[PDB]
Amino acid sequence: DNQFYSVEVADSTFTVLKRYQQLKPIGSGAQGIVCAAFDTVLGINVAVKKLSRPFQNQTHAKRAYRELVLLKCVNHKNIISLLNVFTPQKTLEEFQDVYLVMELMDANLCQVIHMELDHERMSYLLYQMLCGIKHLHSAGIIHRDLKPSNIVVKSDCTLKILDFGLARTACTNFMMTPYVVTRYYRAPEVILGMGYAANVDIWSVGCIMGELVKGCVIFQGTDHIDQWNKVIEQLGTPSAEFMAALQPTVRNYVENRPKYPGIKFEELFPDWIFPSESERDKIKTSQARDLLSKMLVIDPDKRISVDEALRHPYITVWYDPAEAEAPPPQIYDAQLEEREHAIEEWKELIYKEVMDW
Ligand SMILES: Cc1ccc(-n2nc(C(C)(C)C)cc2NC(=O)Nc2ccc(OCCN3CCOCC3)c3ccccc23)cc1
């Protein structure tokens, strides 16, 4: 051996390749622990996620296996890409821990929202988000949890989408980065229990987009019921056509709420909150608002697609087919994940996935 060394991190032990130095805990939960580290070989800072014996039970096992498999299906600069996957254990019989390495970014979108962004920066961030989303969707992956804390950035305005769910509990949780609840970013079709398609993510991008402008959460409801009130208060009561797709109980609840005409987007998102130094900013403001009005549509059938959004005048200035059309290596298949496995089998599946990386 002599490849691995151990360090005390949290209430645990990180046994990692000697190339990873200066480990500092930055995130913790029941499903995983993330440290910042310096990669001496790459000469860069990295983030190392430890999954501690992910096979310990059925819930942990399926989540560890799903993570490894999902990350196997993606290959895009605007999505988390693994620099390394390893285990310090040498055989299956003794296999215990899995370590995932990614590039350390500078900040998450939470820390970007209350900065003075211009149209060029805003449209570029949005462009990258859309590129990332398009890649995921073509890989058969709906994120479902697109929110500012799941989006990471560097000082050059480059951006990546990830999923920093660690199944956090009272004892386990610790964060060196801001967190925000998913609720504010859930599409109405999710809220109302409708069953959904990939464009739930487009709704989330519109919420994120609006927040980048206003500096405040767009639909800040106290709970899932209240989210709906905040949606209709601004966008207005949805169509009978939309309500017809609801289950009878949810349908009647929705029909019982006060009727709202909806606020004009020129009024919800006024010129003054946008950059306006030049005549060209005025043009860009109109484009941004138009794109916003097409993402924040209650009915997913009437909501803009990622394809259309990438072609929108606000976004298309950045369009490069090498980025916005890059295909994923394969489409995610949930078959082996949704198979039932004894713990020993999950152990071997996860093991093989690591050794194969
Ligand atoms: C159960 C489960 C299943 C799937 C996922 N999942 N799904 C996706 C898609 C949808 C985007 C493909 C991605 C992921 N997984 C992740 O995004 N995992 C990670 C999150 C946060 C991290 O570190 C955050 C710290 N941050 C890193 C960037 O630099 C600043 C600090 C990580 C650090 C190292 C390795 C993995 C990390 C997650 C969980």
Domain boundaries, the chain: 4-106, 107-326
What is the C-alpha to C-alpha distance for residues 213 and 217, in angstroms, rounded to an integer? 10
**Distance of CA 155 to CAs 104, 126, 145, 213, 354, Å?**
12, 16, 24, 19, 32
Reduce the DSSP state of residue 141 to 3 states and report it: coil
Instruction: Give which of 96, 97, 67, 63 is closest to 80, Cα–Cα.
Output: 67
Pairing of strands 44-51, 84-86: unpaired
Could you tell me if 25 and 174 are in contact, meaning their C-beta atoms sit under 8 angstroms apart? yes
Q: Where are the alpha helices (DSSP H) in the chain?
A: 58-72, 119-138, 188-191, 200-214, 224-235, 240-243, 248-256, 265-268, 279-295, 306-311, 313-316, 321-324, 343-355
Is 145 tagged catalytic? yes
Instruction: Give which of 109, 106, 116, 83 is closest to 16, Cα–Cα.
Output: 83
Helix axes 279-295, 119-138, angle to 10 degrees: 30
> How many angstroms is it from 34 CA to the middle of ligand 1?
9
Give, for ligand 1, the residue of 57, 102, 158, 160 to mutate: max count of ligand atoms closer than 8 Å to Cβ: 102
> How many angstroms is it from 18 CA to the middle of ligand 1?
22
Q: Is the CB of 328 under 6 A from ligand 1?
A: no
Which DSSP string do the residues of 224-290 spell out, in sequence order?
HHHHHHHHHHHH-PPPHHHHTTS-HHHHHHHHHSPP-----HHHHS-GGGS--SSHHHHHHHHHHHH
Q: How many residues are present in the chain?
A: 357
Q: Is the CB of 79 under 6 A from ligand 1?
A: yes
Kindly give the number of the ligand 1 atom that is closest to the alpha carbon of 70.
12
Annotated active-site residue in 39, 97, 145, 201: 145
Place of tokens 């310990």: 56
Residue environment code for 90-111, b if the CB has 16+ CB neighbours within 10 A, otherwise e: eeeeebebbbbbbbbbeebbbe
Classify residue 191 by its DSSP letter. H
Pairing of strands 44-51, 33-39: antiparallel
Please give the resolution of this entry in Å, rounded to 1 decimal. 2.3
Could you tell me if 208 and 151 are in contact, meaning their C-beta atoms sit under 8 angstroms apart? yes
**Distance of CA 188 to CAs 150, 191, 204, 252, 254, Å?**
20, 5, 10, 15, 11
Question: Is 30 flagged in the annotation as binding?
Answer: yes
In the CATH scheme, what architecture does the domain 4-106 have?
A: 2-Layer Sandwich (3.30)
Kindly give the number of the ligand 1 atom that is closest to the alpha carbon of 145.
10
Give, for ligand 1, the residue of 77, 151, 163 to mutate: max count of ligand atoms closer than 8 Å to Cβ: 163
Question: Is 49 flagged in the annotation as binding?
Answer: yes
Instruction: Give which of 213, 210, 215, 256 is closest to 235, Cα–Cα.
Output: 210
Q: Is the CB of 354 under 6 A from ligand 1?
A: no
> How many angstroms is it from 162 CA to the middle of ligand 1?
5
Instruction: Give which of 1, 100, 30 is closest to 11, Cα–Cα.
Output: 30
CATH superfamily of 107-326: Transferase(Phosphotransferase) domain 1 (1.10.510.10)
Q: What is the CA radius of gyration of the chain?
A: 22
Could you tell me if 273 and 213 are in contact, meaning their C-beta atoms sit under 8 angstroms apart? yes
